[PDB]
Write an enzyme that holds these catalytic residues in place. Sequence first.
Site, short mmCIF file in Angstrom:
data_model
loop_
_atom_site.label_atom_id
_atom_site.label_comp_id
_atom_site.label_asym_id
_atom_site.label_seq_id
_atom_site.Cartn_x
_atom_site.Cartn_y
_atom_site.Cartn_z
N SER A 66 4.12 1.79 8.54
CA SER A 66 3.77 0.81 7.49
C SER A 66 4.93 0.34 6.63
O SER A 66 5.68 1.16 6.11
CB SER A 66 2.72 1.40 6.56
N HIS B 14 0.81 -1.22 0.00
CA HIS B 14 0.00 0.00 0.00
C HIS B 14 0.85 1.29 0.00
O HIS B 14 0.36 2.34 -0.41
CB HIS B 14 -1.02 0.00 1.15
N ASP C 178 -0.46 -7.38 1.69
CA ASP C 178 0.22 -6.10 1.79
C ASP C 178 1.73 -6.30 1.97
O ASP C 178 2.28 -6.12 3.07
CB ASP C 178 -0.38 -5.29 2.94
N1 LIG Z 1 -0.75 -1.13 14.34
C1 LIG Z 1 -1.58 -0.04 14.15
N2 LIG Z 1 -2.41 0.30 15.10
C2 LIG Z 1 -1.50 0.69 12.88
C3 LIG Z 1 -2.34 1.71 12.47
C4 LIG Z 1 -1.97 2.19 11.22
C5 LIG Z 1 -2.59 3.20 10.49
O1 LIG Z 1 -3.67 3.81 11.05
C6 LIG Z 1 -4.57 4.78 10.52
C7 LIG Z 1 -4.31 6.13 11.16
C8 LIG Z 1 -4.12 6.18 12.54
C9 LIG Z 1 -3.85 7.39 13.15
C10 LIG Z 1 -3.75 8.54 12.39
C11 LIG Z 1 -3.92 8.49 11.01
C12 LIG Z 1 -4.20 7.28 10.40
C13 LIG Z 1 -5.97 4.22 10.71
N3 LIG Z 1 -6.41 3.29 9.87
C14 LIG Z 1 -7.62 3.01 10.32
C15 LIG Z 1 -8.53 2.03 9.69
C16 LIG Z 1 -9.87 1.99 10.05
C17 LIG Z 1 -10.71 1.07 9.44
C18 LIG Z 1 -10.23 0.18 8.49
C19 LIG Z 1 -8.89 0.21 8.13
C20 LIG Z 1 -8.04 1.13 8.73
N4 LIG Z 1 -7.81 3.78 11.41
O2 LIG Z 1 -6.79 4.47 11.58
C21 LIG Z 1 -2.05 3.53 9.23
C22 LIG Z 1 -0.95 2.85 8.72
C23 LIG Z 1 -0.34 1.83 9.47
C24 LIG Z 1 -0.87 1.52 10.70
S1 LIG Z 1 -0.39 0.42 11.75
#
Ligand SMILES: NC(N)c1cc2c(O[C@H](c3ccccc3)c3nc(-c4ccccc4)no3)cccc2s1
Lengths: 235, 54
Positions: free
Chosen positions: A185, A41, A89
């Site tokens: 990521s 991604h 991914d």
């Molecule tokens: N191990 C973890 N907890 C990770 C969270 C997270 C991420 O999170 C997104 C995010 C978080 C905080 C600030 C900006 C963006 C995020 N992604 C999601 C999400 C929700 C629903 C479905 C898929 C993803 N929610 O948040 C983006 C990229 C990598 C990771 S790894």
Amino acid sequence: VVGGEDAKPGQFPWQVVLNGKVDAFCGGSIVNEKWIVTAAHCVETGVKITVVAGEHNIEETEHTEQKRNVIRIIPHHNYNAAINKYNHDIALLELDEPLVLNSYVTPICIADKEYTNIFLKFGSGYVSGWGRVFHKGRSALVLQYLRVPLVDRATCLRSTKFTIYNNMFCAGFHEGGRDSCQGDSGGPHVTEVEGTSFLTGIISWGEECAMKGKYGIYTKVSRYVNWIKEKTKLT
Amino acid sequence: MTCNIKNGRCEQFCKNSADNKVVCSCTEGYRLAENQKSCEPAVPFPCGRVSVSQ
Ligand SMILES: NC(N)c1cc2c(O[C@H](c3ccccc3)c3nc(-c4ccccc4)no3)cccc2s1
Ligand SMILES: [Ca+2]
């Protein structure tokens, strides 16, 4: 990484940072001098991505850094964002020029399919990256790391309304506080075995960061071991 | 002695021999130590090792 610790210089010499549209949008792990494994991604078309190895402080000069261009990018053939955003991914980045290896630029080991699973089941792996350090705040100067426990599969399915595939596993703490996060990521989930670390996962996604009941979701590298070794061969 | 218990005492990988014994082995960059159990560097900078003394 939320709730991490500062890495020491040389502590994770397989870690790389990725620069593209913005610096350090994603992480990676060194497979060998010519190849880097990261998350699929992180690959947006049109974007020249630059890889930087031997990095510790993202805005200072350690004189251990090696910067390279990505000439070829191989996202997994089953990976397709329009079907699922984070299934399969994993992606390989080929570097224009081989990295020169040293104590700061050293590959991560990759066992076979079986031992990668065994090593995953040890129950604990070190996650690392320069991603966010607070749920919504600011990215990291020094390389962060965190030792995350394997979460059980049934337990993980209960945690989410989203679909956790057999190509994924979950790691983290039940009561939140400490987790991987946005920007991390593509960074490695490694398992250390008598002094030798082995790649057991790719940091991939999660629902929010360090929140209770919500676990990190990592690409199960064991399922892609044969692929990585086919594609990254040296001559 | 088999690979069933304590990974045949093999630090990295163990495979059952037919003589009811264990042949241990290592990942790329490593060689079996004269121990026949541990894995020692066979290259200047082998994978998965911290070599900046902490
Ligand atoms: N191990 C973890 N907890 C990770 C969270 C997270 C991420 O999170 C997104 C995010 C978080 C905080 C600030 C900006 C963006 C995020 N992604 C999601 C999400 C929700 C629903 C479905 C898929 C993803 N929610 O948040 C983006 C990229 C990598 C990771 S790894
Ligand atoms: Ca630096």
